[PDB]
Design a protein around this ligand. Structure first.
Ligand SMILES: CCCCCCCCCCCCCCCC(=O)O
Ligand SMILES: *C(=O)CCCCCCCCCCCCC
Lengths: 238, 55, 273, 238, 55, 238, 55, 55, 55
C-alpha cells in the first residue's frame, strides 16, 4: 500500500477537466476513417471566410433580404453619409450574427484586423466613388465626410473590379478587446461617405445597392471560451 | 514508457496512458494545424492578391 | 491481416472455366469456403474491420450478477448463505454454455446495499453498517447463527466491507479439480448410474455466507448482497448450440419443448409475423 | 504520503472495467492445462460454420423437422417462387435462431458477406435448375423471376454435386449494419425461383425437399457487445 | 519492470502487475488468434474449393 | 497532486490480502535468531511422517489404546477379512484424525500416493502371510479374498522384517480429490485378508496385533486452504 | 530500486518496500524449500530403501 | 521526465508536472533574485559611498 | 531521483521527498552515532582503566 495523500480538488468534477477514463466498450473496433472534403481544424479557419453583413437593421427589414442591402443613389450633392456602425464584432447587432460574430460570441476576448469587402451591385453603367473610413475611438463618430477622411480610410472607385476592401487595422491600447461591450475596450467607428456621387446614364436605374462582407485577417485570434447568449430554451425539446 | 510534451505558455509535462483503448486517452488539445484555403480561396485558378480579379 | 483484421475482398472478373467454387457437397460435413469473388465479379476492398470484440475473452469478460439474497438486522434470517453456482442466473449461464468445457480465472465483485424496514421503533439512529462475506470450501464448518465461532475465518477467506466504500472485489483462480470447468456432464455421480445426474454432480464449489458485523440501529434493517462473476483468462473448447428453450431448473438442463423460431406467414413473406 | 488527487469515476464499478485485484487464494496451484480437442478463440470461428436454416416458419411447422424443409415439386410451369426472406441475419425469424444469428444477437453491429448453401435432398433421379438470387434494397422484393434475375444471382443446376452456394456479397452504404431492425440499415431480399421445373421419371417421387445452410464469410465481423433478447427469467432458478 | 503494449485503434499503454498471483492480472483482451479449420473443414482429405467435392 | 482513481476493492479488508503496513515499533531490534533443531518449511514435511492409524474405531475402543490394534489370530481357515476401510484420507474416521488427516482437514483438495506401513506385533514365534489390497472404485468393496486379489495388492509375509508397506498408488480420474466427501471424487477400498493363516507353536500366544502407520509419498500435495471442522468453541476461553 | 519476481502459475510482478522496518514488508509466500529428512528418516545409519532394515 | 531541485535548509525533492497548462504548476517559491538599485540608488551619476554627495 | 536505504533487521526501502522544505521530510530514525566520552570520562588527563586513578 503506497503511502498517498489526497489534495484539494480531489473527487470534484470540473467541466473543463482533462483526464483518462476507462472505456465502456473494451476493444471496440472503430469504423475506419474516410477522406471527407473540407475538414476543419480551428474555428478561425471559418472566421476568415467572408459572410454578408446586415448593415440595414432598420426596423422591419431584418425580416427580408433588404437587411443585407446598402442604399446608394444619385444625389444633388456629395459628402452624404451612406452608413455607419461601430467596431464591435461581437456586440453590435450589425456583426453579432455574422459568421465572424457567431464565433466571437463563444469567446470573451478578440484581437486582430478585420476585412470589410464591399461589392457594388449597381448596373454596369452606374459609376461613382465612395470613401470607406475607420476612425479609432477617442473623439466621436465623424459626422461629416471632411472629418472622417482625417482617419484611416480607403477611397473606393467603382469599376470593372466590383468589390473593394477596407482593412480595419487592429489599433487598440490592449492586446485583446472584449467580445462583450465595454468602453475601456472601445473599438472606434466605421463609416462610409459619397466621394463623388453615383452617376448613371438614361435608361439605367439611379438607385442601387452595395453589399458588405466581413471576415478576419491572418492576425486574428480569440480567447476565454464561454457560452453564447444567442441560444436558449425552457425545457428539453421533445 | 511515458511521453513528455510541452505545456501551454507565453516547461514540459509527463503522460502515461493507463488503458488498453485509445478512446480512454485524454483530449488532443494541442493540434494547432491550420488550412484556411479549403474555405477562403477554393478557386481553381490562383488569384494573386496584388492583381485584378478580372481583366 | 493485423493479427485480428478480417480478410480483404479480392477483386475478380468474368469467368468461364470448369472451376466450380459454387458447387460443393454439404454431406461431407465441410463448410464451403466460397467468397463473393467466386460467384460474381468483385472489386478490390482493403478491409480494416477487426474481430477484436469476438474473442472468447471479450465475449465472457463482463461482470454479471449471478445471484443475490438478503439477510436482516435482526429477526429470523440474520445471515445469508448461498451454494455457489452460475446457473441460477440465465444471462451469464447461457453464454458460458456456448461451450462444452471452459477454463478461466474469476473476478468477483459484490454490491451490498441496505434498506430500512418499516417498524414502530421511536428515535432510530443507525450507525454505519459493516458486512462480512465468507467463503466455506466443501468440508468446512458452517455458521449456524450470526455469532457462530466460524466467522473467525482463521483460514477461510472472507472480506469485510463498510457501506459507502467502493464495492468489495477480489480475484479467484481456476478452482477446478479437473483440467477445465465442465458446463455439461452427461453422466452420473454413482457408478451404478444412480444418484445425481447432470452438471450438478460436478458442482462442489462450496458455500458463501454473508452477515452484518454490527446491528447499527435499534430499528430493523434489511441488506441485499449481489454476487457478480467476471471470467478472466478464458479458454473454451467444443462450441455447442446456444440454449433455445428457457431455463427451468438450476441443477439440470430440463426444459419445456420449444419451437425452432418465431413464425411468419408463408415462405414468401418478407415480414416477421 | 505522495500527494494524489482522485478524479471522476473514482470508486465506481463499471461492469466492463478491466483492473487488477488481489487473489483470495494466495499461491493457489492451478490444475495443469490439458490438450482438449476443438478450442475456440473467437466467436466468428463458430459463425463460419454452416447450420440448417428454418426457411419454413409457416404456422405449426416450427414445431417439427418440417421447419427446415423447402418444398420443391414438379409443376406445370416455371418461374414459380420457391421461397423468399430478407437479409436480416439478426432480426428475421428465418436467421435469428441460427448459429450465425444466435451470435449476432449478442452484438449490435454486423458486416460481411454471407453464404447460403443449398442441398437438394430429392432423389438421385430427380433433376431441375433453380435461380438463387439476392436483390439489394431500394426497390421492392422481386415478385417475378424475370425481375429477380436482374440482381445478384446464381443459377444452380442440380446434379451429382448435391449442394450449391449463393454468396450474398456485402453490399451496403455503411461499413456496418444493425443486428436489430432498422430501415436505414436495410439489407435487401433473398429469393429463389424455378429456372427449369423439377423433372422426375416414373416410380420416383415428384415432391422433394431442399435444405438451406447459412454461415459467415472470411470478411464477417461483429461490434458493440450487448445482451440477447432470446433468454429471460422471472426468478432465480432453483 | 513494466510492460508496454498497443491500445486498440483504427499509441501504447503501460502495465505493471502488482500482485503475486497471475490470477490477479487484468484480462487478456488482445488475443486475436483464429483457426476456423477445426470447425469449418474438419475433413481428412483436403477439399479444394474450385474442385468438385465428389467425382 | 497526482491524478488518481480508486477501483473496486478499495478500502476493503480481505482476510487473505498481502500488503505492506507501517510498523508500530519503529526501529525495534528483533532478538537475533538461533539454530533450533527441527525447523519446518512446508506442512507436507509432516504429512510424510508415519503416524499410527486407528483402524479399530469399533464402539468404545476409541477410548483406549485398542483403537490402534488390528486383531489377528490363528483360524480354522483362510480368506478371512482382517479389516477394510475406504481411501478417504480426509473424511473417513480411520484417517481423519491422523497426522496426515489433520493436515488434509485444513485444505479442500488432495493428490498423491499414500503409504500404509503394517507392523506385526505378534511374537517372534508367530508366523503367517497377509494380503494387503487396494481396489479402485467402480465396483464394490471386495467381499472375498479371491475378489480383492484382482486389484492392486501386496502379499506380505511376516518374518524378521517386522513391517511391510502397501503403497496406495494415486489412481483417479482427476488430478485432485476432495478432502471432504464426494462420490465423484471416490477413492476406492483398502482391505486386508489372510493369505495363509497365523501359525504359532505351543506356549506362544495365538492371538496377535498388527499396527498400521500412514504417511504421504513424495508426489503428495494439498490445495485450497480452509478451516478445520475438528475444532470449535462457544465463547472466548478464560 | 524496485525488485521483480515471478507470480504463481501453471509473468512477473514489481515490488518496492516503502517502510524503514523489514517487519512492514509483505509475507514471504514463495519459500518452497523442503527437507523431510529431519522428520522422516532421522536415523544415524543411512537406510537404503531396497535393503532389509535389519539383518 | 521529472525534475529534481534543492529543498530549503540551513537534500533534494522530485517534481513531475501532470497538467498541459503551465498555469497548473506549483508556485515559484525559490526565485531569490535581488536588485535594490532600481529603487535605492536610481541616480544617473554613480554615487561613490566614501565620497561627498556634493562638491 | 529517489534514494534507497536499508531497513532495520537481525533489504532496502525507497524514498522520494515530495516537498520543497526539508522540514517536511520523515524522521531521521537511523542515526546510530555514539559518543559517551563527553559525559562518562570528561577528564583532562586520560585515565587508563588498568591503572590506579591516583598515585
Ligand atoms: C470471499 C471468497 C469468495 C470466493 C468465491 C468462490 C466462488 C467459486 C466460483 C466457481 C465458479 C464457476 C463454476 C461452476 C462449477 C461446476 O459446475 O463445476
Ligand atoms: C519496474 O518496472 C520498475 C520500474 C519502474 C517502477 C515504477 C512504477 C511507477 C513509479 C512512478 C511512481 C508512480 C506513482 C504511481
Amino acid at each position: 500500500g503506497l503511502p498517498t495523500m489526497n489534495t484539494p480538488g480531489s473527487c470534484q468534477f470540473l467541466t473543463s477537466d482533462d483526464f483518462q477514463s476507462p472505456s465502456a466498450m473494451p476493444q471496440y473496433d472503430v469504423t475506419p476513417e474516410m477522406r471527407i472534403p473540407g475538414e476543419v481544424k480551428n474555428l478561425m479557419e471559418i472566421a476568415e471566410v467572408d459572410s454578408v453583413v446586415p448593415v440595414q437593421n432598420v426596423g422591419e427589414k431584418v425580416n427580408s433580404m433588404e437587411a443585407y442591402q446598402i442604399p446608394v443613389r444619385s444625389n444633388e450633392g456629395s459628402g452624404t453619409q451612406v452608413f455607419g456602425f461601430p467596431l464591435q464584432p461581437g456586440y453590435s447587432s450589425v456583426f453579432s450574427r455574422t459568421l465572424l460574430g457567431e464565433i466571437l460570441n463563444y469567446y470573451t476576448h478578440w484581437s486582430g484586423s478585420i476585412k470589410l469587402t464591399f461589392m457594388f451591385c449597381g448596373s454596369a453603367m452606374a459609376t461613382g466613388k465612395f470613401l470607406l473610413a475607420y476612425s479609432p475611438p477617442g473623439a466621436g463618430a465623424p459626422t461629416k465626410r471632411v472629418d472622417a477622411m482625417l482617419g484611416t480610410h480607403v477611397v473606393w472607385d467603382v469599376g470593372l473590379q466590383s468589390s473593394c476592401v477596407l482593412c480595419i487595422p487592429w489599433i487598440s491600447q490592449t492586446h485583446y478587446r472584449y467580445v462583450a461591450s465595454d468602453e475601456y475596450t472601445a473599438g472606434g467607428f466605421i463609416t462610409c461617405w459619397y466621394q463623388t456621387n453615383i452617376v448613371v446614364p438614361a435608361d439605367a436605374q439611379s438607385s442601387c445597392y452595395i453589399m458588405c462582407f466581413v471576415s478576419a485577417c491572418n492576425d486574428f485570434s480569440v480567447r476565454l471560451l464561454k457560452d453564447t447568449p444567442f441560444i436558449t430554451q425552457q425545457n428539453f425539446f421533445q | 514508457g511515458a511521453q513528455v510534451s510541452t505545456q501551454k505558455t507565453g516547461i514540459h509535462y509527463t503522460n502515461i496512458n493507463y488503458y488498453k483503448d485509445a478512446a480512454s486517452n485524454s483530449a488532443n488539445r494541442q493540434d494547432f494545424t491550420q488550412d484556411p484555403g479549403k474555405f477562403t480561396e477554393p478557386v481553381k485558378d490562383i488569384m494573386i492578391k496584388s492583381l485584378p480579379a478580372l481583366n | 491481416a493485423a493479427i485480428g483484421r478480417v480478410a480483404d475482398t479480392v477483386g475478380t472478373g468474368p469467368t468461364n472455366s470448369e472451376a466450380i467454387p459454387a458447387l460443393t457437397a454439404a454431406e461431407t460435413g465441410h463448410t464451403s469456403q466460397v467468397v463473393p469473388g467466386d460467384t460474381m465479379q468483385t472489386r478490390h476492398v482493403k478491409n480494416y474491420h477487426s474481430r477484436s470484440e469476438s474473442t472468447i475473452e471479450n465475449f465472457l469478460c463482463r461482470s454479471a450478477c449471478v445471484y443475490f439474497t438478503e439477510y436482516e438486522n435482526s429477526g429470523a434470517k440474520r445471515y445469508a448463505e448461498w451454494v455457489i453456482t452460475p446457473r441460477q442466473a440465465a444471462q451469464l449461464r447461457r453464454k458460458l454454455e456456448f461451450f462444452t468445457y471452459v477454463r478461466f480465472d474469476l473476478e468477483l465483485t459484490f454490491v451490498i446495499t441496505s434498506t430500512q424496514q418499516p417498524s414502530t421503533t421511536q428515535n432510530q439512529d443507525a450507525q454505519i453498517l459493516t458486512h462480512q462475506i465468507m467463503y466455506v470450501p466443501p468440508g468446512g464448518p458452517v455458521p449456524d447463527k450470526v455469532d457462530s465461532y466460524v466467522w473467525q475465518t482463521s483460514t477461510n477467506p472472507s472480506v469485510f466491507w463498510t457501506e459507502g466504500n467502493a464495492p468489495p472485489r477480489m480475484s479467484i483462480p481456476f478452482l477446478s479439480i479437473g483440467n477445465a470447468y465442465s458446463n455439461f456432464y452427461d453422466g452420473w455421480s454413482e457408478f451404478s448410474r444412480n444418484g445425481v445426474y447432470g452438471i450438478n454432480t460436478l458442482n462442489n464449489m462450496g458455500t458463501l455466507y454473508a452477515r452484518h458485523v454490527n446491528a447499527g440501529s435499534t430499528g430493523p434493517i434489511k441488506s441485499t448482497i449481489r454476487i457478480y462473476f467476471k471470467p478472466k483468462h478464458v479458454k473454451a473448447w467444443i462450441p455447442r448450440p446456444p440454449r433455445l428453450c428457457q431455463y427451468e431448473k438450476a441443477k439440470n438442463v430440463n426444459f419445456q419443448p420449444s419451437g425452432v423460431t418465431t413464425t411468419r406467414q408463408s415462405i414468401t413473406t418478407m415480414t416477421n409475423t
